[PDB]
Amino acid sequence: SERKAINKYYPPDYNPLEAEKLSRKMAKKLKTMNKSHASIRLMTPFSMRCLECNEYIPKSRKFNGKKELLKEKYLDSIKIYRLTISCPRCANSIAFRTDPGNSDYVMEVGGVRNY
Amino acid sequence: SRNVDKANSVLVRFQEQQAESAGGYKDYSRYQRPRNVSKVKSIKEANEWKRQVSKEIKQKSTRIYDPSLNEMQIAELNDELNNLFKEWKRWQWHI
RNA sequence: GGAGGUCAACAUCAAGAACUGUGGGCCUUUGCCUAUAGAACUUAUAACGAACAUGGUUCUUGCCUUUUACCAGAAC
RNA sequence: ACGAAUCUCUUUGCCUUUUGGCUUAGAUCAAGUGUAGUAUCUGUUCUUUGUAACAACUAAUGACCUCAGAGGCUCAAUUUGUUACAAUACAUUUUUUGGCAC
RNA sequence: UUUUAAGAACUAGAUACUAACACAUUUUU
RNA sequence: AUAAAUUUUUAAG
RNA sequence: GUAUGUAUUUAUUUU
Ligand SMILES: [Mg+2]
Ligand SMILES: [Mg+2]
Ligand SMILES: [Zn+2]
C-alpha cells in the first residue's frame, strides 16, 4: 500500500468494458455522484464584508466551500462557476461568479466588497 | 483528491455489483428514495428502505429543538421534516 | 559382546607457545624451587569452518533537503 | 462616660478572571509559475370479435357445538365449456364497370 | 395519498481533485 | 614500447 | 504529500 502504486489487483475475470457498462448503469442510483453540487477548498481574492454579523474576511482566507457549475455559459461556449463560502461568525452562505470577459470576480447574496 | 472521488471509482463499484448477485450486501445507505413507492419490491427490502427514512427523521427531529437561532432555516428544515414524515406514511401504506 | 545412528545430554576448543596430576623443600593455603607420570581435538604463509554472512556504538568519508535504507575504511 | 455587637462608607495591606515555551523577528506580504500524485465522463432513440340461452365454480367479523389453536354449521358481477345468428374476393345479358351525352 | 423514474441500443471526443514541495530565476540576441 | 575502468533503489515527510 | 472530527438503536426489562 504505497502512495505511488503501479498495479491494482483485479479479479481473475473482470471484463473491463463490461464493468464500464454495468458501472455506467450503477452511476445513476448513487446519492453522491449525482449531487449536481461540488466541494472545493479555496481562498477569497477580493476580501469581503459580511452582511449579517458584518464580519470581515480580511484579504485571502482558506475556506472549505462549494463550487457549482452554472447553467449560464459565457459567450457561446465558456464555462462559468458559482462558489459559496460560509461565514465564520454566523451561518451564512455567500456566492461568487467568475466573469471570463472581465477577469475579476463579481459576487452576490450575502456579502459586499471593500474599496 | 477527497475520498468522494475514491469511493465512486469503478474498482469500488464492481465488487458491489458482485455482492448484489452473490449475497445480501448493497447497503441502501447509497441510493436515494426511490422516488415512487408502489414501484418498490418484496417486503424484506422496503423494510430497509423504510428505516433508511426513519433515521433521517431522527437526525433532523433532534435538529428541531436546537437553540441555534436560524428561524428561516428551521422553517425550511421544518417543511423538509413534513415531507419526509409523509414519505414514512407512504412506505407504511405500501406495507 | 562387536558394528554402526544425518540420536541425545554433559564436558572442552585461542594461550607465558601456552595442559593436568603427583612426590619433595622454603615462606606462610596461595606462591617459589626441585622430582615424576600422562597429554584427545585445534594452531606457523598461525587455527576449531582448507569455508563466509549480518548487526550495535564510535570515529573518518561518500551520495546530499530531512529519517529509515545506504556509499567504504578503521577500532571496540 | 467607655466596654460590646450589627449595618454602611473611605484609606492602607493582600490582588483575587492579572499576557504560559524554543528555532533563521520562525519565514513571507507576489499581472507570476513550476513540479509531484490520484480519478473518469456528457447527448440521442425505443419500451414500461359482438349478442342471446343453458350448466358449473367463486377473505374478514359474530354466535353455537366438539376435541387438545383446529374442524363443522348459520347470518349482514367475473371466469370456463356447448349451441344458434351476424360481420371480417373481384369487371363480359337482371342491379355496382352503365347506352352516356350534345 | 402523491408521484416517475428504471431497462435496452447508439455517438464523438478529453476533463476534475490535492499543494503540504520548490520558487534569486540567471543569462547569450 | 600501454596493458590501471567509480556508480546503479524503496518508503515517509 | 490528498486532513481530521461528531452522529448513525433495528429487535419495546415487570410499578
Ligand atoms: Mg520533520
Ligand atoms: Mg506533515
Ligand atoms: Zn457573518
Residue corresponding to grid cell 427523521: B57
Contact A39 B4 (CB under 8 A): yes
Grid coordinates of A47: 476580501
* List of E strands, B1-95: none
The beta-carbon contacts of B11-17 under 8 Å, at least 24 apart in sequence, are B11/A8, B11/A10, B13/A19, B13/A22, B13/A23, B13/A26, B14/A11, B14/A14, B14/A19, B14/A22, B14/A23, B16/A26, B17/A22, B17/A23, B17/A26
Final resolution, Å: 3.4
> Could you give the CA distance from residue A92 to residue A85 in angstroms, rounded to a whole number?
8
At A63 the three-state DSSP class reads: strand
A71 has a chain B CB within 8 A of its CB: no
DSSP assignment of A81-92 equals: EEEEEE-SSS--
Contact B16 A26 (CB under 8 A): yes
Residue A11 CA, distance from chain mean position: 35
Residue corresponding to grid cell 428502505: B49
Compare all CA atoms of chain B with the CA of A20 and give the residue at the minimum distance.
B10
Contact B14 A8 (CB under 8 A): no
Q: Domain count for chain B, please give it.
A: 1
Residues of B in contact with A23 (CB under 8 A): 10, 13-14, 17
What is the domain extent for residue B50? 1-95
Burial track B35-53 (b if 16+ CB lie within 10 A, e otherwise): eebeebeeeeebeebbebb
CA of A3 to the centre of ligand 1 (A): 19
